[PDB]
């Protein structure tokens, strides 16, 4: 009928609020959405959103001069992947001790906060919050 | 006092699901935020959601911060403290420099860059809590 049972595969509609503690022994799956694009200067950003967290991965290669503090203007991050607060995504350049960060502001117009750079392989995975 | 397959309902008691669960909508956990100046100009902004704390590093280093030193202006409040030491890796604006700040279980954070008296520290990530 319309009641939830303690056995069986079932579908449950409606907003369910659990006021106590919940334990899940199996998997807990939320839908995922993805996006990727070349932000600018050869740098690729790939995103996977699940709930209120976005998992990022930095790809590509720096193939043109990217000025210090500059906007990455080839692609903006779409609104559905944009954070409420500006976030600083730390990455690292292959082969040395050099780190950088790319900011993802609420507008999705990303910015490079390393020094002026024109070569190298930028990498880094991590997360930022969304709402 | 029964849960139904339709409708908005509030459910009390510890519920243990032994199987797999799928949530097609949003899944909302308790949340609390805090931000403060740890010391030497450095700001730490936190938001806890369940057993994870989302952090972002801010501010501007504006006094001498010794290598390995305690940041004594503000501690991370107990409810945001990890069970064991966490190392939050950040980057300084304008160059290739990186640092990390440790958050021990006491919440008295420590600076692990070299001795520094200037620069703009940044970095967003997460750390776990109990």
């Amino acid at each position, epitope marked *: 009928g319309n009641v939830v049972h303690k056995t069986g595969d079932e579908t449950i509609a409606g907003k369910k609020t659990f006021t106590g503690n919940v334990e899940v022994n199996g998997s807990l799956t939320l839908p995922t959405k993805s996006w990727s694009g070349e932000l600018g200067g050869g740098i690729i950003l790939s995103l996977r959103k699940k709930g209120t967290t976005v998992e990022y991965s930095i790809g590509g290669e720096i193939s043109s001069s990217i000025l210090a503090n500059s906007n990455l203007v080839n692609r903006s991050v779409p609104n559905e992947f944009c954070p409420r607060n500006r976030c600083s995504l730390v990455g690292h350049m292959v082969g040395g001790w050099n780190a950088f960060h790319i900011d993802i502001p609420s507008s999705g117009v990303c910015q490079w906060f390393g020094p002026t750079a024109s070569s190298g392989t930028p990498r880094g995975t991590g997360t930022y919050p969304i709402d | 006092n029964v849960v139904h397959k339709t409708g908005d309902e509030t459910i009390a008691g510890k519920k243990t699901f032994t199987g797999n669960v799928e949530v097609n909508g949003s899944l909302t956990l308790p949340t609390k935020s805090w931000s403060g100046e740890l010391g030497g100009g450095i700001i730490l902004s936190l938001r806890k959601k369940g057993t994870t704390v989302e952090y972002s590093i801010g501010g501007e280093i504006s006094s001498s911060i010794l290598a390995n030193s305690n940041l004594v202006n503000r501690s991370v409040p107990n409810e945001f403290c990890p069970r064991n030491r966490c190392s939050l890796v950040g980057h300084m604006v304008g160059g290739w420099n990186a640092f990390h700040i440790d958050i021990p279980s006491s919440g008295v954070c420590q600076w692990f860059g070299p001795t520094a008296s200037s620069g*703009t520290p940044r970095g967003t990530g997460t750390y776990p809590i109990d």
Partner: nanobody
Amino acid sequence: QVQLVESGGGLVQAGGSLRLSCAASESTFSNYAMGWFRQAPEREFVATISQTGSHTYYRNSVKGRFTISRDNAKNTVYLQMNNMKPEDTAVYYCAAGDNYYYTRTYEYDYWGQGTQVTVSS
């Protein structure tokens, strides 16, 4: 998106007070952290304030002398400057950004035209 207009600048004797105001043309103002910056050299932050006004941050040289505040009902942010010093002479700019804990001009997204503040010794 915000249009920002500063007012309140002018001449002041050393040790005196001056209050700057920055009015925003939209109610979306409350979604932004606000910052006061000054340009004598490059443009440097002076004070920042979170969306609700619950958090503030000041440059060391203005601590205890300057106070940043906002009136979300009036779409305005203020900078109360007391015990002014020749140090403080510059064009002051208000800016809107995502977070008060960000301090660089690059980390702010909207700017006012600026207002001149001159302190005599």
